[PDB]
Structure 1
Amino acid sequence: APCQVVLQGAELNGILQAFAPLRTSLLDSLLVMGDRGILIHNTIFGEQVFLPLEHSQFSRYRWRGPTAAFLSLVDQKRSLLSVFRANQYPDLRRVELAITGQAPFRTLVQRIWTTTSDGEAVELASETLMKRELTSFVVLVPQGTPDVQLRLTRPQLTKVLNATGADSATPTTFELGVNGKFSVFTTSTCVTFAAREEGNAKTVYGENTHRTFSVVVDDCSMRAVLRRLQVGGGTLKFFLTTPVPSLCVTATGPNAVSAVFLLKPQK
């Protein structure tokens, strides 16, 4: 088959770990496959959510032809990402994805194998799901380099999230001050750390920590979303120049998800 993707041993373990903290958050999503890997996109509480699976994270990844997108759900209660669900497949041994055909009529056939067989004779052990690509699909994805980056530890991200506002009547400001003082606050909450360029729990590390800014987040769904994705720690990436500023929070780890929030436009 022209397009083949295999998850076995180590890499299957890696994907399984990537999904653990995510629980059911991405079961209903858009699978965007191409030569770079699988980009899983969603919307949570209205916010843009992405989970990139670099091709290098699979046991085998072979892609040819135009990029292809699939709805993860083959039916209301079943999804192409259900295998990776925490403990739904106890004896899980192998997962294979095969895309056959030609745009816009390619088909995705997902085959699963448990510790009840040997190899991948296909016909043998299994559970299989099939999905037709989308003929037409659109996805707006982030790009470009962030103007500032602040890596935060688990407890640090938690302090921040606890500071962010949760309603239209309580704006939140992310401010990188003169001295490299990073602060997040509302009219009833405040938290601050000391930047410092990455060459003591109040010290956060980042890139271009000299570029000050005072951005405000809209109605701020940050806490709800990140709490839902159970993000441990993460890196805050600020895109300050585009007409609409944006803050992307990428989780710390190997195959971490990212949530992108829009900041109020300035000037």
Structure 2
Amino acid sequence: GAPCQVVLQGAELNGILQAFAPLRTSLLDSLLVMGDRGILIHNTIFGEQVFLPLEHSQFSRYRWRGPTAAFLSLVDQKRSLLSVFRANQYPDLRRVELAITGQAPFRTLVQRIWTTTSDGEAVELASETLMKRELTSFVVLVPQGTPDVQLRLTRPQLTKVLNATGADSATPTTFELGVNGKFSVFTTSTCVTFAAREEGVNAKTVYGENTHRTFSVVVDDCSMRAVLRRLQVAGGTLKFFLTTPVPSLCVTATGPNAVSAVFLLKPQK
């Protein structure tokens, strides 16, 4: 086949069908930048950016020998190399496999499926294998490294954070940390707080890293409530990047794999 092979056997394909399961048709109109150290599936929802890195360890067998190839997810803009990955699209999936043959400017992907039917025999549908060429020139942009502040959150907490602040445009949505280990996210009307603690090496204690740093940051467009509630995010962790001249804050889905949205803020007043 290709030199560069991806395969998901049922164990790892259940572990990924669940990653796509917490629920979406978001990341179907996507972009996959595949290379060594895995597939990065990037999309923009409500303007803001969302990433879902799919590590090479997270597949059953992965090997990328060659430079990165970038595939638009929607093959002829209708199907999707991940439209198989939904919860209950074809509920007989046993294996899926990707081989991207050819050379560095013209690597072309083929995706193959395998269902099981009774007596456990495994049938490849020849009508639900997709094939997508690479992109000649993509330019994708990415976040960086160990964050400037970091804290853990849970589905009730995160619900509280989104509902608190996220009030629609004409409402400046302000995140803030206080001394004595305090977090607050407040807006023109609502103000919810949480104490963050150590041991991260009743609904308002989190256990984080970078637990010392304050900030009074503000987001300008109001998407956190709606990006995060579109991915049906069951909580997660928040990670603040403040070094760059505009901070960006990266909310992840702690539950096992991630669809992480990164958010660009109003210049701190």
Give the TM-score, by structure 2 length. Answer: 0.94
Report how far residue 49 of structure 1 moved: 0.5
Report how far residue 82 of structure 1 moved: 1.0
Moved more, 113-122 or 70-79: 113-122
Q: Match of 2:57, SS? A: helix
Report how far residue 266 of structure 1 moved: 3.7
Report how far residue 240 of structure 1 moved: 1.4
Report how far residue 93 of structure 1 moved: 1.1
Report how far residue 127 of structure 1 moved: 2.9
**Residue matched to 1:239:** 241
Alignment of 1:40-189 (within 5 A): 40-116=41-117, 127-189=128-190
Deviations 1:197-256 (A, max 9, x none): 225221112112111111111122100000000011111101112100111101112211
Q: Match of 1:55, SS? A: coil
Query: Residues 107 and 130 of structure 1 are in contact (CA less than 8 Å); yes or no, is this contact kept in structure 2?
Result: yes
Report how far residue 90 of structure 1 moved: 1.5
Q: Distance in 2 between matches of 1:253 and 1:52?
A: 14
> Cα gap change, 1:121/1:56 in structure 2, threshold over 3 Å: closer, same or farther?
same
Structure 2 residue ranges without an equivalent (≥5): none
Q: Match of 2:252, SS? A: strand
Q: Percent identity?
A: 100
Query: Residues 173 and 185 of structure 1 are in contact (CA less than 8 Å); yes or no, is this contact kept in structure 2?
Result: yes
Deviations 1:149-186 (A, max 9, x none): 11011100000000113333111111110111110011
Q: Which runs of 4+ in 1 moved over 6 A?
A: 117-126
Report how far residue 125 of structure 1 moved: 6.8
**Residue matched to 2:230:** 228
> Cα gap change, 1:177/1:123 in structure 2, threshold over 3 Å: closer, same or farther?
closer
Give the TM-score, by structure 1 length. Answer: 0.94
Q: Distance in 2 between matches of 1:233 and 1:6?
A: 29
Q: Distance in 2 between matches of 1:177 and 1:168?
A: 25
Q: Distance in 2 between matches of 1:136 and 1:206?
A: 40
Q: Match of 2:103, SS? A: coil
Q: Distance in 2 between matches of 1:93 and 1:219?
A: 42
Q: Distance in 2 between matches of 1:98 and 1:89?
A: 21
Does 2:250 match 1:248?
A: yes
Q: Distance in 1 between matches of 2:119 and 2:106?
A: 32
Moved more, 37-46 or 162-171: 162-171
Aligned length: 267
Q: Match of 1:263, SS? A: strand
> Cα gap change, 1:118/1:136 in structure 2, threshold over 3 Å: closer, same or farther?
farther
> Cα gap change, 1:120/1:260 in structure 2, threshold over 3 Å: closer, same or farther?
farther
Report how far residue 124 of structure 1 moved: 8.0
